[PDB]
Design a binder for this molecule. Structure first.
Ligand SMILES: Cc1cncc(C(=O)N2C[C@H]3CC[C@@H](C2)N3[C@H](c2cccc(F)c2)c2cn(CCc3ccsc3)nn2)c1
Lengths: 302, 300
């Protein structure tokens, strides 16, 4: 029993974290095979950041301007290239600790683990979700750039996030490992701000199914709803639309618990109307939206 | 910015987890140098473990480190932990120590299944000596640890789930945390209490992160506040707690008894539909050190 925000074991990623230094700037890089991936803004000065011309800055760099350090070992850079907003530094040594891995771009609502890192040394691991507004509510201090987000399935590490910046509301923005930002953000000091966030409805429903699995039914009711009536109400609480894909995805949890998806939608509607009246669900006094349907089946059943 | 329930990087521990099978029981062990540590209740069959173990032969214990088999060459018990001597020392053994933690202190848990780590989370030793973990069948032998520089301090090994869903275990010397035994008897968690010094730490974390609405002009005294704590089933606040929070008090300008007044008012009046660091409840599983470490970055 129990239900925690559980991260993946981080060892496979730990063995890939290095320090990258350009000029006065040091941040983290991800060392896979003979390539080190890091945010391209490592080549910028703070001045450059209003309107940086990355192509112009990079053509001026020599391989030996990049200092890469893996533990106590300096790696020799032998080439470099830029892919979208990520710098790829080719190094003379392949990482002998390279796990089986892939690069995956995730959708809003997906979860992943973050290995927060400073000066190429991992500090801690925690679970995160990609918010509907393409930010993440992480925990990152100065020097955390280049920290990565990942899932691990059957010993394959799927890298899905690389950290670039903190937005003014204290939430975080970054790219996939092909260097494409999530959301409308840019690696430029601009007046960019997180869009208004919403609640990840399909994840809330999955968590409610998790509550029933672990033995709590107090929030259920005898009503049902149409999908469209549910969305009409949910939008009034800044909940994300629930799609037929979402209904299909919850099929297994519906089947396991005996509670039809649209009946669980009726319960959520009432919870939004009533609050919890001093009660908790899986230890929380708020509705949790950073557990996915996949996560629930992974942690609750096996 | 931000504040998350954060665990230590688990890599150094992952390389020590093994699967231990005896009879019909399979569970997780911890392989350090040439010993595998696991719960003694892996022993076959009111138990008398010193008797049951006499019956077992080394070869009754199948130990799998991934795909490799470690051969057992010896066994002994230390309290509720079984120690299997194996023929191969773990080449991935980290620098480590066995430590016993105090209620209120936190640690990371690497939850495992068939000697395969599957998740890591951060927990506190509750005042009632249980932990609010997430464990399913097969988790027994999963371990808790902290990392200080390069040194792993192992502090917990999971032995059982209790009827309220919380969990009980031992230190790595096999001494239970709390009034529990490893046998099928009637056992229950005692009434728990809230860890006051940790709630205060988390309020400081909130302030550091810009959440200041609960602050007020008032201050108080230990004696006065401790009467409120007892009323609300909060642990007593000691002078040593006050000293430990010293740093955060200096960094935010909010003295502990200044912050206690904020907490008193939250306990008496509630949060009035507001939240702190994204919670509608007062959180008590972050220590002062956890807050300082995460709001001022240390790395391992
Ligand atoms: C609280 C916190 C959370 N998470 C990360 C940090 C953190 O550390 N950074 C993120 C921000 C803020 C400082 C610096 C690094 N970023 C600036 C920036 C501005 C606009 C877009 C963008 F993508 C980056 C920047 C980059 N550069 C080039 C030299 C350099 C690159 C890395 S450090 C210095 N100059 N300003 C902080």
């Amino acid at each position: 029993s129990g239900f925690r925000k559980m991260a993946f074991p981080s060892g496979k990623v730990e063995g890939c974290m290095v320090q990258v230094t350009c000029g006065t700037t040091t941040l983290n890089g991800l060392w896979l095979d003979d390539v080190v991936y890091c945010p391209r803004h490592v080549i910028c000065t703070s001045e450059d950041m209003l309107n940086p011309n990355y192509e112009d800055l990079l053509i001026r760099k020599s391989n030996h301007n990049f200092l890469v350090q893996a533990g106590n070992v300096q790696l020799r850079v032998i080439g470099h290239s830029m892919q979208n907003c990520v710098l790829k530094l080719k190094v003379d040594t392949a990482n002998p600790k390279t796990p089986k891995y892939k690069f995956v771009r995730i959708q809003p609502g997906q979860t992943f683990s973050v290995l927060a890192c400073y000066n190429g040394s991992p500090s801690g691991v925690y679970q995160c979700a990609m918010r509907p507004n393409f930010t993440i509510k992480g925990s990152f201090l100065n020097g955390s750039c280049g920290s990565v987000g990942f899932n691990i399935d059957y010993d394959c590490v799927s890298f899905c996030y690389m950290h670039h910046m903190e937005l003014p509301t204290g939430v975080h923005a970054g790219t996939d490992l092909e260097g494409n930002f999530y959301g409308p953000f840019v690696d430029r000091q601009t007046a960019q701000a997180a869009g208004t966030d919403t609640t990840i409805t399909v994840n809330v429903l999955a968590w409610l199914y998790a509550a029933v699995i672990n033995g709590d039914r107090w929030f259920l009711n005898r009503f049902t709803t149409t999908l469209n009536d549910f969305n009409l109400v949910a939008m009034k609480y800044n909940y994300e639309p629930l799609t037929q894909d979402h209904v299909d995805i919850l099929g297994p949890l519906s089947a396991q618990t005996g509670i039809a998806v649209l009946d669980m939608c009726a319960s959520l509607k009432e919870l939004l109307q009533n609050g919890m009246n001093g009660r908790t669900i899986l230890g929380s006094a708020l509705l949790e939206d950073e557990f996915t349907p996949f996560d629930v089946v992974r942690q609750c059943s096996g």
